[PDB]
Ligand binder design. Structure first.
Ligand SMILES: *[C@@H]1O[C@H](CO)[C@@H](O[C@@H]2O[C@H](CO)[C@@H](O)[C@H](O)[C@H]2NC(C)=O)[C@H](O)[C@H]1NC(C)=O
Ligand SMILES: *[C@@H]1O[C@H](CO)[C@@H](O[C@@H]2O[C@H](CO)[C@@H](O)[C@H](O)[C@H]2NC(C)=O)[C@H](O)[C@H]1NC(C)=O
Ligand SMILES: *[C@@H]1O[C@H](CO)[C@@H](O[C@@H]2O[C@H](CO)[C@@H](O)[C@H](O)[C@H]2NC(C)=O)[C@H](O)[C@H]1NC(C)=O
Ligand SMILES: *[C@@H]1O[C@H](CO)[C@@H](O[C@@H]2O[C@H](CO)[C@@H](O)[C@H](O)[C@H]2NC(C)=O)[C@H](O)[C@H]1NC(C)=O
Ligand SMILES: *[C@@H]1O[C@H](CO)[C@@H](O[C@@H]2O[C@H](CO)[C@@H](O)[C@H](O)[C@H]2NC(C)=O)[C@H](O)[C@H]1NC(C)=O
Ligand SMILES: *[C@@H]1O[C@H](CO)[C@@H](O)[C@H](O)[C@H]1NC(C)=O
Ligand SMILES: *[C@@H]1O[C@H](CO)[C@@H](O)[C@H](O)[C@H]1NC(C)=O
Ligand SMILES: *[C@@H]1O[C@H](CO)[C@@H](O)[C@H](O)[C@H]1NC(C)=O
Ligand SMILES: *[C@@H]1O[C@H](CO)[C@@H](O)[C@H](O)[C@H]1NC(C)=O
Ligand SMILES: *[C@@H]1O[C@H](CO)[C@@H](O)[C@H](O)[C@H]1NC(C)=O
Ligand SMILES: *[C@@H]1O[C@H](CO)[C@@H](O)[C@H](O)[C@H]1NC(C)=O
Ligand SMILES: *[C@@H]1O[C@H](CO)[C@@H](O)[C@H](O)[C@H]1NC(C)=O
Lengths: 35, 238, 86, 99, 366, 49, 50, 34
């Protein structure tokens, strides 16, 4: 390197996948009422 | 007119905490209600400072000399390399009247002293003084503590002074107070060592610290008096 | 750049016309700010007034309606908002 | 009334503007390679033939700083305009009618 | 002006910005301390004897009034050249801590006195700093420093372990180990004395005649001023946009009495961003104040060249107290955005045609 | 721009505070990216199964 | 002369860095607009019928 | 403690999991309890 750095994101891929899973489960079971 | 002192007086090399003392005005520019950061020579906070309860101490770059003297026993200071006529030497004395600052090739023996008789007139600190350079006289400097900062930069001898009554017994007070510039001497000397003078009765506590280059942050109040300071490199929080 | 100096002005004169664009950008910014405020707040054509008697079926709007006593003619919440921010 | 830090956005905008102005006015105290930071002194001390070089250094430095400030202002103004458009749409759609 | 700025012979209705207005200074004021003692310069310049190059004489001069015109116009000096200040401006500046160093060198070593210079005297006897500011004078002394019997009192350092730092004095004279064995005070092989003498003789030609060289070094704003040039001080003016020359510090503004509480050791205060605010006059020691003279852009309001040819002029952010070409043209109105001349204030309220600001705007009827 | 050189740092030091602004801008960008992801994805109070 | 050469290198590298930062700012603004659009789409077309 | 973002000193590591207030990165963050 020559003074350049890369910072990892705060949210990991697993947590993003878990958010998507929660959204999809909510929209499948409860319809739109959970929003 | 001096003799070797048989009584080899011994002052223990005590070590104590510097706390938050040794801050002086760096220039002559008035400021109010502002936080100013500047890099200069300063005594690092919470350092180890030597307490003597009269040897030769190296001058290094700067000296912070403090004395909780009572009845004004401390008299003056000696500066030079070998303290002999072979090299230029500097002397400051605070006698009963206006002070004396003298630069000559002064000759010193082992244990110089002033002494007093019980009218009061005794002066045999040195033995010879052939070639002199500078002479200066001004107002005398003198339970009560006196702090001085000596700097020798660019042929200028800056002396910053501050005296304050103290009620604490032994330890240095845990407070903050600036050191206004008192004396500027436009004389350049290659000093390496310095001494101390005592008013011995012909019929002893002081603190020494050294300065280092670092950056400070200072706060100015409404009237232009420094009331708070921070050392840049002491703590991640700092 | 110059601070009222003839020599600096003469030397800057030969750098082409850089300052006209600089002033024109800031002028555009200011005009855009005025247009933003005007188009976000001026939404009606007339100035309406509430009736002197206020009986809205039990709902209480006193906290949001303007107070004529205050010279600013601002409501309670508007005063709180203006005081909170520096 | 009680809870603080409820108006972060407007305070942040004000702080950003003030900070930009402060750094712009503070950049006037830099040598930029010349022998001094005040142009009156270099006028009153030294002859034109290379004094003009010194003012050239000052001019290029200050002009570059001004350009950077102007560009930052343009970016921030674009962002503010986008937010204002959103506010106007929200106010039209949610105050003048049920959304 | 609107036509010139728009580069068009026709102008549509609206408000435009042409130029900027600013107040002009009226007179000047000078305030210098109560110092008139003459400065001894011929004592060090017309001195009979000068010390050797390795032991150059140094003097510090202060608390005096020195005239540099009499030194510059004199043609007795062979070389007169300065570095930081043009000579003609020397009389116009006040300095502190003037250093004068005097020494004697050879004809070919005059080039050695310069920042960043490599040679023998420049690095073994006297080193000049790269950032040196000041001036250097040189002249010939063959008629007085050259003896028919030969002058050997003039010596120069020739041998040293390394070069010399600038403004460093060397007086030590010890035998040099030019080989790999100690000399032990024996000047035989690989052992030379550090000092080499001179052969100054009147019969010698150019490049070897004795030369006397002096230097003058100053400082730039490190302490209260002590040595100035020949100048005359005027009195003080209150509430007037003027330019001031306080103790060599030059500026422009309006001077007002200030209630700031200094301390007996400052000279001039400020607030932020290197903006001088209050200064202390040397003669009276008064806490003054500096405020910039008012300025601001000007704007013109016109209803269009199609309709008429009369305009209104607005000075932005300026008190309607110092308006002045068009000052006595029409009525004056004071707004939150500045002052306005050429339009009449009315108590009615119509829609806004040409916005002015602060909630008010103008239209054409007049 | 200096690559751990003392004299280069000293020469750069007389150009004012250009680098504080450059460092500030990049941190602002990074915080913006995290906020973007957080607001686009985190819209449920709980986690369903 | 090292000051001269270092000065030339410094001004060149500083100019390049400034250009890079400005381009990054523009790109970040565009990506932010896209992210706002995506967030609105998720809010409207997923949590309800549009 | 060692994390995907670097090395952390002056902070304890626990098995628990709370709401994130001072973000650190890589899906972990710290808070004042020490
Ligand atoms: C204290 O020191 C001062 C010097 O500051 C002495 O004053 C000198 O006295 C002698 C004797 O008459 C005079 O010749 C000098 O001119 C005085 N000096 C000055 C500066 O006025 C004073 O005598 C000393 N007091 C003592 C030793 O008790
Ligand atoms: C700083 O200066 C101000 C103004 O002179 C001082 O404020 C007053 O000072 C007088 C005399 O010292 C007091 O009698 C008043 O009570 C002060 N007014 C106050 C304190 O509101 C002030 O004391 C000075 N010192 C500090 C630390 O502010
Ligand atoms: C609507 O709410 C306001 C709250 O401010 C009520 O005003 C208060 O009324 C009580 C009862 O008379 C008084 O004790 C308070 O002093 C009032 N506060 C203020 C700020 O005026 C108001 O009465 C409510 N409206 C109705 C119709 O009850
Ligand atoms: C040093 O001596 C020289 C003479 O060698 C002085 O120069 C003369 O100064 C008077 C001043 O009234 C002039 O009228 C003469 O014309 C000068 N003559 C020459 C040959 O220069 C000089 O003033 C003396 N003092 C210095 C140089 O400080
Ligand atoms: C323009 O200057 C005048 C002159 O100072 C200002 O009038 C003064 O206003 C102050 C504050 O109201 C009073 O204390 C003075 O007595 C006024 N002096 C005179 C001669 O009237 C006027 O306020 C200024 N205008 C603006 C917009 O600031
Ligand atoms: C100062 O040094 C002595 C030993 O030289 C040590 O005993 C003492 O603790 C030190 N003081 C501090 C405050 O660390
Ligand atoms: C100062 O004195 C010391 C000896 O006390 C010596 O070693 C040093 O070289 C001297 N420095 C100068 C600049 O004369
Ligand atoms: C003092 O000055 C005299 C006069 O030149 C000189 O002879 C003597 O050596 C000097 N004293 C010392 C210690 O150098
Ligand atoms: C300077 O001289 C004038 C006139 O004699 C006098 O009024 C003033 O007080 C003097 N100032 C100082 C600082 O001595
Ligand atoms: C404006 O210009 C048009 C076209 O020349 C003309 O018909 C009209 O009378 C003009 N208006 C005024 C007020 O002169
Ligand atoms: C009406 O305007 C005149 C000036 O034209 C002014 O003197 C007067 O105070 C105004 N009256 C009202 C009620 O605005
Ligand atoms: C708690 O943390 C310790 C520390 O590593 C670990 O040994 C232990 O297994 C953890 N227990 C649980 C239930 O996570």
């Amino acid at each position: 390197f020559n003074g350049l750095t890369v910072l990892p994101p705060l949210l990991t891929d697993e947590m993003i996948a878990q958010y998507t899973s929660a959204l999809l489960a909510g929209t499948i079971t409860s319809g739109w009422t959970f929003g | 007119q001096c003799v070797n002192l048989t009584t080899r007086t011994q002052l223990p090399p005590a070590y104590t905490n510097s706390f938050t003392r040794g801050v002086y005005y760096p220039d002559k520019v008035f400021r109010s209600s502002v936080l100013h950061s500047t890099q200069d020579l300063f005594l690092p906070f919470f350092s180890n400072v030597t307490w003597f309860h009269n040897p030769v101490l190296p001058f290094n770059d700067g000296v912070y000399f403090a004395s909780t003297e009572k009845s004004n026993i401390i008299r003056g200071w000696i500066f030079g390399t070998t303290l002999d006529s072979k090299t230029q030497s500097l002397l400051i004395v605070n006698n009963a009247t206006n002070v004396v600052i003298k630069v000559c090739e002064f000759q010193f023996c082992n244990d110089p002293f002033l002494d007093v008789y019980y009218m009061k007139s005794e002066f045999r600190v040195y033995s010879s003084a052939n070639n002199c350079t500078f002479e200066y006289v001004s107002q005398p400097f003198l339970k009560n503590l006196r702090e001085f900062v000596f700097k020798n930069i660019d042929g200028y001898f800056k002396i910053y002074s501050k005296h304050t009554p103290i009620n604490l017994v032994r330890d240095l007070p845990q407070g903050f107070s600036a050191l206004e510039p008192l004396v500027d001497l436009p004389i350049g000397i290659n000093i390496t060592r310095f001494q101390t003078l005592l008013a011995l009765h012909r019929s002893a506590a002081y603190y020494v610290g050294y300065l280092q280059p670092r950056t400070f942050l200072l706060k100015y109040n409404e009237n232009g008096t420094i009331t708070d300071a921070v050392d840049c490199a002491l703590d991640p929080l700092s | 750049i110059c601070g009222d100096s003839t020599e600096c002005s003469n030397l800057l004169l030969q750098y082409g016309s850089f300052c006209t664009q600089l002033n024109r950008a800031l002028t555009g910014i200011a005009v855009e700010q005025d247009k933003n405020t005007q188009e976000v707040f001026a939404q009606v054509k007339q100035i309406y007034k509430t009736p002197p008697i206020k009986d809205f079926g039990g709902f209480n709007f006193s906290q949001i309606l303007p107070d004529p006593s205050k010279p600013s003619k601002r409501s309670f919440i508007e005063d709180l908002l203006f005081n909170k921010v520096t | 009334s009680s809870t603080a830090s409820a108006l972060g956005k407007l305070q942040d905008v004000v702080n950003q503007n003030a900070q930009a102005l402060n750094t712009l006015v503070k950049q006037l105290s830099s040598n930029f390679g010349a022998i001094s930071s005040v142009l009156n002194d270099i006028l009153s001390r030294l002859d034109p033939p290379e004094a003009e070089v010194q003012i050239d250094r000052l001019i290029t430095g200050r002009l570059q700083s001004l350009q950077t400030y102007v560009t930052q202002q343009l970016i921030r103004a674009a962002e503010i305009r986008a937010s204002a458009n959103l506010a106007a749409t929200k106010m039209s759609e949610c105050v003048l009618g049920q959304s | 002006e609107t036509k010139c700025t728009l580069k068009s012979f026709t102008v549509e209705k609206g408000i435009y910005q042409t130029s900027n207005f600013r107040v002009q200074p009226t007179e000047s004021i000078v305030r210098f301390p109560n110092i008139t003692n003459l400065c001894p310069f011929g004592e060090v310049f017309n001195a009979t004897r000068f010390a050797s190059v390795y032991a150059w004489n140094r003097k510090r001069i202060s608390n005096c009034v020195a005239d540099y015109s009499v030194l510059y116009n004199s043609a007795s000096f062979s070389t007169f050249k300065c570095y930081g200040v043009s000579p003609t401006k020397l009389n116009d500046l006040c300095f502190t801590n003037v250093y004068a160093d005097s020494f004697v060198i050879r004809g070919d070593e005059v080039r050695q006195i310069a920042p960043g210079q490599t040679g023998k005297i420049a690095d073994y006897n006297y080193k000049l700093p790269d950032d040196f500011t000041g001036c250097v004078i040189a002249w010939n002394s063959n008629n007085l420093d050259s003896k028919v019997g030969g002058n050997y009192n003039y010596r120069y350092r020739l041998f040293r372990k390394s070069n010399l730092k600038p403004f460093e004095r060397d007086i030590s004279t010890e035998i040099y180990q030019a080989g790999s064995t100690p000399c032990n005070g024996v000047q035989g092989f690989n052992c030379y004395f550090p000092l080499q003498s001179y052969g100054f003789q009147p019969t010698n030609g150019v490049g070897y005649q004795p030369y006397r060289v002096v230097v003058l070094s100053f400082e730039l704003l490190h302490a209260p001023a002590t040595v100035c040039g020949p100048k005359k001080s005027t009195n003080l003016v209150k509430n007037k946009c003027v330019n001031f020359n306080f103790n060599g510090l030059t500026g422009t503004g309006v001077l007002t009495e200030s209630n700031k509480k200094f301390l007996p050791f400052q000279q001039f205060g400020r607030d932020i961003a290197d903006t001088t605010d209050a200064v202390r006059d040397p003669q009276t020691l008064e806490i003054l104040d500096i405020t910039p003279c008012s300025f601001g852009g000007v704007s013109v309001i016109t209803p269009g060249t199609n309709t008429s040819n009369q305009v209104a002029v607005l000075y932005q952010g300026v008190n309607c107290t110092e308006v002045p070409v068009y000052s006595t043209g029409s009525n004056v109105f004071q707004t939150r955005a500045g002052c306005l001349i050429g339009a009449e204030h009315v108590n009615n309220s119509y829609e806004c045609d040409i916005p002015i600001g602060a909630g008010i705007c103008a239209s054409y009827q007049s």
